Design a protein around this nucleic acid. Structure first.
Ligand SMILES: O=P(O)(O)O[C@H]1[C@H](OP(=O)(O)O)[C@H](OP(=O)(O)O)[C@H](OP(=O)(O)O)[C@@H](OP(=O)(O)O)[C@H]1OP(=O)(O)O
Ligand SMILES: O=P(O)(O)O[C@H]1[C@H](OP(=O)(O)O)[C@H](OP(=O)(O)O)[C@H](OP(=O)(O)O)[C@@H](OP(=O)(O)O)[C@H]1OP(=O)(O)O
Ligand SMILES: [Zn+2]
Ligand SMILES: [Zn+2]
Ligand SMILES: [Zn+2]
Ligand SMILES: [Zn+2]
Lengths: 467, 350
RNA sequence: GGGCUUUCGUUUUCCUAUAUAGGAAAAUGAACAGU
């Protein structure tokens, strides 16, 4: 498409612009307007009235690079284009609506919503403890050397980051007097706390997680059954399923870790190679095998695991079960005994909302992202997912960035009289926890050896930053 | 000033390829003279361990800057071929002190243009960020080596980054060890960057990293070697969208004395693109032949009997300056510079 | 897409001088580059 400035006239304080829309070889009515923006708007408008029906204008030039290739994957992509779970979904969407009940209208576009719910006992109605949105990631140009950017903005990732913030706040509130009212209890020996046996966590995602959890058409939608059994039913129809995959920059689809030996480097990515962020399904598998508390929090807590995952669209039991937890158990249980307690695999109950909301438009997916934690009250953080910073001219720091998490870690280490950890860097602090690092390395080695590829890590200059 | 350099390099490349990551070396006879592109190179790849050759028939770094330097070396060999008593006035070389060696004339200078920043310490900065170096962090200024399968580098069979090699050029000269036997060191007058230009980290990367702790390094540098501080500039207008388009691993090299005959190599191996696997004209063997012809023409039969390693170590001044520069880099806390085993350079021409 | 940070150019108002030109505050419309 082209918008030609046919003519500019008039004095600087009241100019008149004359614009014309052109698509390929077809020209449209020329228009007078008061501003360039409105010139383009009226030119487009005239073209559309001429051809809402011809559609000639519609076909030309998409900008980012493309390749959904797994095997003959073009037909698959074209086909794709064309606790009581309902309680979790209603809680998540009511919390979102209440938070954004009277905010700016920019949050009226399509979005992906994720939430984490905590249930203190059996009759607990349920309370949202996190919330995240967004569908984009950062570019290779927008990375930071001091951890001032968020490398992802998918809804589940931001939700887990909010859960991390909530865990930090709840650890702040803990003390000797209010040990009973707190969700934590002393573990064996009292060195590190642990979650109470009555407290559980659930996760709801408005769509299927990107990656190994969405290689099937929407027409493959299974019906909702309230099966009492908790035993999963994974299906390994082809070898290609089970492969790991990354969200490449400026590309469309979700492509496996190929025989692409391009080593992620800081200056290399700056010079123009493709930045690959891992898919959300792989990250959820990592949470199920390691824990939602990350690596820093494991100093004071045993791993925190999930109990259920509720999806609002594109649910398939045999696909999602393998995507999140069963793909590490395909070749026997020999992987389970290798892992060391308190690190163990987690098999959360998978579920689907009773009926999907059929209004799922494919196009016009904006980049804005929203974050909210329990401690924040009514405060929501809105980020521009393309840059990984707070959406605004000042592009201030994001409260879910690695720097703020490190600040919270320093505050908690000072509060808990952990002087030795107070003098370490971010990378060394993460490497201080021998058990979590050993479990993570073993899990990656097991993934590689059994035959699903190799995990893609950010450049070492980006993980270990300067503070 | 740098806009003319960039446009000259681009025009020369387009004209030669009529029948991108592109570096060039440009020689400007005088200030009023526009200048002429003298060496040209392209590429982004580096060979691996399997492509390493003991006899030296493969170029172990097909990057743009390195291959442009190799082309410039070949051009300098050609000019030394052209030098005689009759053409002494019209040449660019003049007798130096003592009459033992020639030297570059004062008016003629050389400049370098690179389309993007060199790998290594030249692109370690974010959007937040007389020479004005920047040393705000302990990690800054460290040596980095090129990684296989990529354009990037990792901090310290390993090939130092382009930034470290540009520093080595700015300290020990451009002509290399062999040309020292017939020339004084030559230093770039200016370095021009097309993309990824930071003043602080480029001047720290290429020149100023050995001036962080005062002037305790220059005094120990025996003459004529000096710590050059070339003028650093950027092209005025630049393409906005960073270019992520996939790039072929072919490398094009050319020198002013070759007319209209470009050579194409593949960076994965380091040989001329063709089933016969021709020997590259910027390889070690061709350079050694060119030098042995210069020595035969100059009646210096002493240097003929020396092999590549012996002739390279024959230049006592250059090798002492190189060792001193390496030791000074190791002292200030930058890690040990890696050198390939001498068996690679211990080859005799047939 | 949004959004903070030299102009061109309107009126009113103030002043100079002789209705006139000039200077000044305000906002008003397009471009603009650092984030
Ligand atoms: O996307 P996130 O949920 O924020 O995960 C990030 C980060 O992922 P990104 O690639 O998106 O930045 C790291 O993954 P890799 O870079 O290694 O691929 C990983 O860090 P580690 O692998 O070193 O553990 C992880 O760490 P954790 O498991 O502790 O949550 C965590 O890092 P941050 O918490 O610092 O953001
Ligand atoms: O080909 P270049 O990159 O321009 O540099 C090569 C080589 O570096 P590479 O092996 O990475 O290509 C030598 O460095 P080493 O790795 O061998 O240590 C280096 O110095 P030395 O030969 O003394 O080691 C230099 O030589 P010079 O000092 O003359 O610039 C030169 O060597 P060649 O031009 O003979 O290949
Ligand atoms: Zn996703
Ligand atoms: Zn399972
Ligand atoms: Zn390079
Ligand atoms: Zn300098």
């Amino acid at each position: 498409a082209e918008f030609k400035l046919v003519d500019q006239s008039g004095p600087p304080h009241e100019p008149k612009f004359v614009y014309q829309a052109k698509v390929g070889g077809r020209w449209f009515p020329a228009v007078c307007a008061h501003s360039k923006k409105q010139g383009k708007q009226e030119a487009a408008d005239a073209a559309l009235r001429v051809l809402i029906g011809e559609n000639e204008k519609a076909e030309r030039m998409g900008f980012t690079e493309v390749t959904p290739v797994t095997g003959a994957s073009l037909r698959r992509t074209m086909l794709l284009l064309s606790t009581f779970h309902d309680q979790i979904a209603m809680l998540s969407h009511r919390c979102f609506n209440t938070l954004t009940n009277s905010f700016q209208p920019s949050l009226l576009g399509r979005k992906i919503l994720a939430a984490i719910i905590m249930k203190k006992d059996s009759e607990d109605m349920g309370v949202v403890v996190s919330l995240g949105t967004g569908n984009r990631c950062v570019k290779g140009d927008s990375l930071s050397l001091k951890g001032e950017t968020v490398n992802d903005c998918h809804a589940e990732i931001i939700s887990r980051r909010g859960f991390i913030r909530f865990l930090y706040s709840e650890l702040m509130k803990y003390n000797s007097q209010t040990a009973k009212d707190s969700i934590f209890e002393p573990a064996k020996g009292g060195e590190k706390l642990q979650i109470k046996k009555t407290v559980s966590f659930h996760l709801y995602i408005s769509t299927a997680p990107c990656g190994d959890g969405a290689l099937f058409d929407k027409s493959c939608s299974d019906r909702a059954m309230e099966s009492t059994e908790s035993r999963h039913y994974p299906v390994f129809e082809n070898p290609k399923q089970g492969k790991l995959r990354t969200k490449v920059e400026n590309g469309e689809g979700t492509i496996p870790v190929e025989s692409s030996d391009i080593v992620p480097t800081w200056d290399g990515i700056r010079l123009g190679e493709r930045l690959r962020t891992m898919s959300c399904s792989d990250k959820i598998l990592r949470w199920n095998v390691l824990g939602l508390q990350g690596a820093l929090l494991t100093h004071f807590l045993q791993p925190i695991y999930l109990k259920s995952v509720t999806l609002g669209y594109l649910f398939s039991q045999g696909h999602l079960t393998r995507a999140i937890c069963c793909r590490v158990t395909r070749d026997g249980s020999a992987f389970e005994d290798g892992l060391r307690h308190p690190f163990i695999v987690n098999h959360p109950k998978v579920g689907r909302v009773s009926i999907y909301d059929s209004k799922r438009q494919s196009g016009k997916t904006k980049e804005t992202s929203v974050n909210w934690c329990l401690a924040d009250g009514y405060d929501l953080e809105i980020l521009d997912g393309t840059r990984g910073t707070v959406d605004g001219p000042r592009n201030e720091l994001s409260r879910v960035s690695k720097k703020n998490i490190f600040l919270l870690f320093k505050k908690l280490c000072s509060f808990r009289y952990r002087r030795d950890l107070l003098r370490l860097s971010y990378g060394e602090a993460k490497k201080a926890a021998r058990d979590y690092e050993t479990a993570k390395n073993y899990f990656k080695k097991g993934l590689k050896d059994m035959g699903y590829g190799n995990w893609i890590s950010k450049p070492q200059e980006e993980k270990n930053f300067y503070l | 000033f740098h806009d003319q350099i960039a446009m000259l390099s681009h025009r020369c490349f387009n004209t030669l390829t009529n029948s991108k990551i592109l570096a060039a070396i440009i020689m400007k006879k005088d200030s009023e003279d526009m200048g002429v592109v003298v060496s040209l190179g392209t590429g982004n790849r580096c060979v691996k361990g399997d492509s390493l050759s003991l006899k030296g028939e493969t170029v172990n770094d097909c990057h743009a800057e390195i291959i442009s330097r190799r082309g410039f070396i070949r051009f300098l060999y050609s000019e030394l071929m052209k030098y005689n008593s009759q053409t002494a006035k019209d040449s660019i070389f003049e007798p130096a002190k003592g009459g033992e060696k020639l030297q570059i004339k004062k008016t003629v200078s050389f400049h370098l243009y690179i389309s993007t920043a060199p790998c290594g310490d030249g692109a370690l900065f974010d959007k937040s960020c007389r020479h004005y170096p920047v040393f705000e962090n302990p990690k800054q200024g460290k040596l980095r080596t090129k990684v296989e399968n990529g354009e990037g580098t990792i901090p310290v069979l390993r090939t130092m980054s382009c930034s470290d090699k540009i520093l080595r050029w700015n300290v020990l000269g451009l002509q290399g060890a062999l040309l020292t036997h017939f020339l004084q060191p030559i230093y770039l007058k200016s370095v021009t960057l097309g993309y990824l230009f930071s003043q602080g980290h480029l001047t720290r990367a290429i020149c100023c990293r050995v001036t962080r702790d005062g002037s305790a390094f220059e005094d120990g540098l025996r003459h004529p070697f000096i710590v050059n501080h070339p003028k650093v500039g950027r092209v005025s207008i630049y393409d906005s969208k960073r270019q992520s388009g996939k790039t072929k691993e072919t490398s094009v090299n050319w020198c002013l004395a070759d007319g209209y005959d470009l050579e194409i190599l593949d960076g994965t191996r380091g040989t001329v693109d063709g089933p016969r696997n021709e020997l590259s004209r910027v390889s070690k063997k061709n350079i050694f032949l060119l030098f042995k012809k210069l020595c035969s023409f100059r009646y210096r039969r002493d240097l003929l009997r020396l092999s590549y390693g012996e002739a390279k170590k024959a230049a006592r001044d250059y090798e002492t300056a190189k060792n001193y520069f390496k030791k000074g880099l190791k002292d200030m806390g930058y890690g040990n510079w890696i050198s390939k085993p001498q068996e690679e350079k211990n080859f005799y021409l047939c």
